[PDB]
Design a protein around this ligand. Structure first.
Ligand code: NA
Ligand code: NA
Length: 310
């Protein structure tokens, strides 16, 4: 892709903005981040303040402050239609919102305890969720109906994150007992399990190349899996104090970002570190790539949404 920002140019990025007014000053912190895939200048954040916010990077305006969650917001997903956004929370709900009406259109109650992960299906019509209640669920966006809800009797433990593979046939759920469980959506079956981590899985990310999966856990490692071989071919081991809270590949699969203790970006081809930011004070809760990796975005417990670019 001619437009993609290459490593030499990416390596020169610096903080270009830091916005602290998206969420409440008295209940400080942003806990979740997503960018709209059809326009990455539209930003979605979940707050410690229980609110979901849509913000325009270009105009630097809050387009909507979406209220209704009764606990902090820990997952957010931006639909490509631009007018739908999704959130989830320790209040055990998944909420579907209209941006233009600044309203909640559905409250999906698939779970009995905190919802730990949220992922939009390839079709754009369904949401996958994971929970501490040990189940995953697949829910219809338009009716809020829970279409299926499944757990592993054998594993029987809290699911800590969930992501669809980009083709929309399989997905992964991380567990509290350090497993990455791969599921076949159609058959509702657990088709493989990737062990090797220690401690709770914290984040998983599927690459757009369709064959890489990156996983992180409390063992302060990021493990890379080739789904064709079902093997862990590379592990990035950080220090044992480091918390990896968020993983994401850029849209091209060229780069992998991690965030938590701080923000780091690796080149997938050579697994070389290409950017490292330590601007946030305290935990970084989200990281994302703008279109063509033309900017990076991050969110922090320090209240800020930061953009990094030339
Ligand atoms: Na650790
Ligand atoms: Na610093």
């Amino acid at each position: 892709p001619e437009e993609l920002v290459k490593p030499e140019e990416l390596s020169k990025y610096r903080q270009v903005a830091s916005h602290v007014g998206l969420h409440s000053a008295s209940i400080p912190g942003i806990l979740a981040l997503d960018l709209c895939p059809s326009d990455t200048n539209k930003i979605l954040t979940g707050g410690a303040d229980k609110n979901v916010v849509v913000f325009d990077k270009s105009s630097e305006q809050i387009l909507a402050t979406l209220k209704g969650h009764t606990k902090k917001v820990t997952s957010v997903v931006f639909h490509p239609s631009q007018d739908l956004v999704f959130s989830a929370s320790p209040d055990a709900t998944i909420r579907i919102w209209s941006v233009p009406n600044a309203s909640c259109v559905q409250v999906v109650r698939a779970h009995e305890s905190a919802v730990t992960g949220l992922s939009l299906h390839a079709t754009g019509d369904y949401l996958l969720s994971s929970s501490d209640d040990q189940y995953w669920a697949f829910s219809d966006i338009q009716t809020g109906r829970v279409l299926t809800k499944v757990t592993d009797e054998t594993s029987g433990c809290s699911l800590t994150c969930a992501q669809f593979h980009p083709d929309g046939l399989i997905f992964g759920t991380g567990t509290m007992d350090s497993q990455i469980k791969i599921w076949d959506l159609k058959e509702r079956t657990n088709v493989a399990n990737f062990p090797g981590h220690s401690g709770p899985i914290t984040s998983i990310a599927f690459s757009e190349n369709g064959y890489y999966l990156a996983t992180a856990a409390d063992d302060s490692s990021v493990k890379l899996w080739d789904l064709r071989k079902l093997k862990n071919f590379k592990t990035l081991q950080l220090d044992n104090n480091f918390e990896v809270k968020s993983l994401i590949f850029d849209q091209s699969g060229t780069y992998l970002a991690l965030g938590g203790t701080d923000v780091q970006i690796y080149i997938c081809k050579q697994w070389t570190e290409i950017l490292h930011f330590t601007e946030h004070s305290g935990l970084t809760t989200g990281v994302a790539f703008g279109h063509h990796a033309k900017f990076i975005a991050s969110t922090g417990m320090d209240r800020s949404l930061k953009f990094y670019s030339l």
